[PDB]
Amino acid sequence: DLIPAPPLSSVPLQQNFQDNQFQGKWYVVGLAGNAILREDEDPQKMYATIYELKEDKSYNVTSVLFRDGCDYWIRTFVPGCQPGEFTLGNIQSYPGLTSYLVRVVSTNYNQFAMVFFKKVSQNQEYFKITLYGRTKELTSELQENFIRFSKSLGLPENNIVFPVPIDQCIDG
């Protein structure tokens, strides 16, 4: 009894998405989804994601996280059906991962973004929304819009966290 993924008709797409302006480092300031839980003796720690636009218009996408120590994982997001949407490249290479979808919901490129993800993995549907910031903090107002958007997708307050800013790893 995991919360079902919302229909896609409920997830907006950023109008006139600009791939070149979305490049760069984004810090995950907010995180919400059906497998995310407000854990208090091990609160989630902030991580970063770096997007890099290639000649073929896919992104190299690199996640940097603290764990023992630092992990850097690089993946490929391939432009999907409509601008702002992507699929995961080389999906054959991820075991038990059946599908993966990304949709940029909104962004102003130089301050924040909200991005929606939905995947099917070991035969289960998982989704999440990240609130990306170009810095490690954002306004209260942008946090509230993120919370409201998340609730609009069926998530209660417990499935929404704000990762604590850190210095190890994520900046190198």
Numbering used by the authors: 6 to 72, 74 to 178
Which of the paper's sentences describe this entry?
We have previously studied an endogenous protein, called LCN2, also known as Neutrophil Gelatinase Associated Lipocalin (NGAL) or Siderocalin (Scn), which has several characteristics useful for the safe excretion of iron. Second, LCN2 captures catecholates, which in turn bind iron; these are produced by Gram negative bacteria, such as the siderophore Enterochelin (Ent), and potentially by mammals, such as the catechol metabolites of amino acids and dietary polyphenols. The ligation of Ent:Fe3+ by LCN2 is a critical step in bacteriostasis because sequestration of Ent:Fe3+ reduces iron transport to bacteria and limits their growth. Fifth, the kidney captures the majority of circulating LCN2 (50–70%) via filtration followed by reabsorption from the lumen of the proximal tubule, whereupon it is degraded.
Hence, to identify residues required for megalin binding, we mutated 18 positively charged amino acids on the surface of LCN2, based on information from its crystal structure (K15, 46, 50, 59, 62, 73, 74, 75, 98, 118, 142, 149, 157; H165; and R43, 72, 130, 140). We found 13 LCN2 mutants that could load with Ent:55Fe and then could traffic through the kidney into the urine, particularly K3 (19% of input). To define the structural basis for iron trafficking by K3, we solved its crystal structure. Views of the molecular surfaces of LCN2 (top) and K3 (bottom) coloured according to electrostatic potentials, showed the large effect on the chemical character of LCN2 by the resurfacing mutations. Nonetheless, superposition of native and K3 structures demonstrated a high degree of overall structural conservation, including complete conservation of the ligand-binding site. In other words, neither the fold nor the ligand-binding site of LCN2 were affected by the mutation of surface residues, allowing K3 and K3Cys to efficiently traffic Ent:iron. The addition of native or K3, however completely blocked the Ent- or catechol-mediated conversion of Fe+3 to Fe+2 (P<0.05±LCN2 with either Ent or catechol:iron, Student's t-test; n=3 each) and the subsequent oxidation of HPF to fluorescein (P<10−7, Student's t-test, n=3, across all points). In sum, biochemical, cellular and animal data, suggested the hypothesis that K3 and K3Cys bypassed the proximal tubule as a result of a failure to recognize megalin. Fortunately, K3 maintains almost all structural and functional features of the native protein permitting iron transport.
